[PDB]
UniProtKB/Swiss-Prot annotation, chain A:
Purpose of the protein: The 26S proteasome is involved in the ATP-dependent degradation of ubiquitinated proteins. The regulatory (or ATPase) complex confers ATP dependency and substrate specificity to the 26S complex.
Protein name (record): 26S proteasome regulatory subunit 8 homolog
Family: Belongs to the AAA ATPase family.
Gene designation per UniProt: RPT6
Cell compartments where the protein resides: Cytoplasm; Nucleus
Whole-protein coverage range: 52 to 102 of 405
Signal sequence coordinates: none
Organism field: Saccharomyces cerevisiae (strain ATCC 204508 / S288c)
Organism lineage string: Eukaryota, Fungi, Dikarya, Ascomycota, Saccharomycotina
UniProtKB/Swiss-Prot annotation, chain B:
Top-level taxon: Eukaryota
Function: The 26S proteasome is involved in the ATP-dependent degradation of ubiquitinated proteins. The regulatory (or ATPase) complex confers ATP dependency and substrate specificity to the 26S complex. Has ATPase activity.
UniProt-annotated binding residues for ATP: 154-161
GO cellular-component term (any): proteasome complex
GO MF terms, alphabetically ordered: ATP binding; ATP hydrolysis activity; proteasome-activating activity
Family: Belongs to the AAA ATPase family.
GO terms, biological process: nonfunctional rRNA decay; peptide catabolic process; positive regulation of protein catabolic process; proteasome regulatory particle assembly; proteasome-mediated ubiquitin-dependent protein catabolic process; protein-containing complex localization; ubiquitin-dependent protein catabolic process
Keyword S-adenosyl-L-methionine tagged: no
Record keywords, A-Z: ATP-binding, Cytoplasm, Isopeptide bond, Lipoprotein, Myristate, Nucleotide-binding, Nucleus, Proteasome, Ubl conjugation
Disulphide bond pairs: none
Protein name per UniProt: 26S proteasome regulatory subunit 4 homolog
Length: 51, 354
């Protein structure tokens, strides 16, 4: 059964919009990190709660 | 005991600080903003409470601030809070950084204090009175006013460099050290911007101590503006002069001039009535040398064979650095001797070398 779910498990992530890498310009007190995505430009944007 | 009461006091302060009801209201004011939002750079302003912006991707949208924070808090050409919708200015955004200007020693109330440098005092009054004195700002008030800057001479690392931070330490303003040879570029016009960037800082961070070292190059008027003569020489200097002859202070932003090439320079580059001050470091006379001697000699550990006069009279009229310098390799000899207490011989040696 380990396999099954596992083999099944990949099925979701195969559905994804994408995952943006980013180049942080900085943060501020806002807890919105201030960033320029590499192909994009600069955006000041919130972080993950886990960091 | 009270330390505990002091600590919790510090703690309770943290709480109230974090306590910034209003929190909701502040969050209400944040809950306004939405998120995540978009960086973008200013361009110009109108009262419109709509203004357009600048982007690396270069959308430029005509957008309002979300208004509690302010337009006038900011200048055109500056990164601002923008939504991702219209790139609506969400409010005041730094665009903090700007941590660069051309070539400088970026320092404030620097290490060098006149005590440190060996006694030069005779000219310390020059730099003190012209600058340190109005730095106290108390007496200069009645004095009705204070020159711009001084002109060092003599040798750096003893007269020129050591003094330089003495009053810079003493007044504890922002000491900005540069060389003209640390300008140019050989190209035309940012030499001024170099200065400008500096003067931007100079204007910005006031009080500050402007320093300048060795204008051999950007400062020479020559005889000519043509026939191979590099414009940038004068082209820079003039602007440096513009911000120089466009400003003197009552004790705020102070200037320093350190170099051996004097009349390479314009009279208005000094502009008396403004720069009144020539510092010139000499070879310290035996006593004044001894004055610096006892300082650096003694702060060097040694054996009682050593004597100042043993060193003093033996001397050619050294620089106050050569004092240090003799003293320097002196121990190096004792290190080559691998000893912690220097004899007198190393001194004579180290001097008769250096």
């Amino acid at each position: 059964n380990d396999k099954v779910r596992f083999i099944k498990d990949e099925l979701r992530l195969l559905q994804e919009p994408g995952s943006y890498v980013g180049e942080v310009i900085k943060i501020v007190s806002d807890k919105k990190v201030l960033v320029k995505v590499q192909p994009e430009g600069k955006y000041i944007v919130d972080v993950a709660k886990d960091i | 005991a009270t330390a505990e009461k002091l600590p919790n006091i510090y703690p309770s302060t943290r709480c109230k600080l974090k306590l910034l009801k209003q929190e909701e209201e502040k969050k209400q004011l944040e809950e306004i903003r939405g998120n995540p939002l978009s960086i973008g750079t200013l361009e110009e302003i109108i009262d419109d409470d709509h203004a357009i912006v600048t982007s690396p991707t270069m959308p430029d949208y005509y957008v309002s601030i979300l208004s509690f924070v302010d337009k006038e808090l900011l200048e055109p050409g500056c990164s601002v809070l923008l939504h991702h919708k219209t790139m609506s200015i969400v409010g005041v955004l730094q665009d903090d950084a700007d941590p660069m200007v051309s070539v400088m020693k970026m320092d404030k109330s620097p290490t060098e204090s006149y005590s440190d440098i060996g006694g030069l005092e005779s000219q310390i009054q020059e730099i003190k009175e012209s600058v340190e004195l109005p730095l106290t700002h108390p007496e200069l008030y009645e004095e009705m006013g204070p020159p711009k800057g001084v002109i060092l001479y003599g040798a750096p690392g003893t007269g020129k460099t050591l003094l330089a931070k003495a009053v810079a330490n003493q007044t504890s303003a922002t000491f900005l050290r540069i060389v003209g040879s640390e300008l140019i570029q050989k190209y035309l016009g940012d030499g001024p911007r170099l200065c400008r960037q500096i003067f931007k800082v100079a204007g910005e961070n006031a009080p500050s101590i402007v320093f300048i070292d060795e204008i051999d190059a950007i400062g020479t008027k020559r005889y000519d503006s043509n026939s191979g003569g590099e414009r940038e020489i004068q082209r820079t200097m003039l602007e440096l002069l513009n911000q120089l002859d466009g400003f003197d202070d009552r004790g705020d932003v102070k200037v320093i001039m350190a170099t051996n090439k004097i009349e390479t320079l314009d009279p208005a580059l000094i502009r008396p009535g403004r720069i009144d001050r020539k510092i010139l470091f000499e070879n310290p006379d035996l006593s004044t040398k001894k004055k610096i001697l006892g300082i650096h000699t003694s702060k060097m550990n040694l054996s009682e064979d050593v004597n100042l006069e043993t060193l003093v009279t033996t001397k050619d009229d050294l620089s106050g650095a050569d004092i240090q310098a003799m003293c320097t390799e002196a121990g190096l000899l004792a290190l080559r001797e691998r000893r912690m207490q220097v004899t007198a011989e190393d001194f004579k040696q180290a001097k008769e070398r250096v």
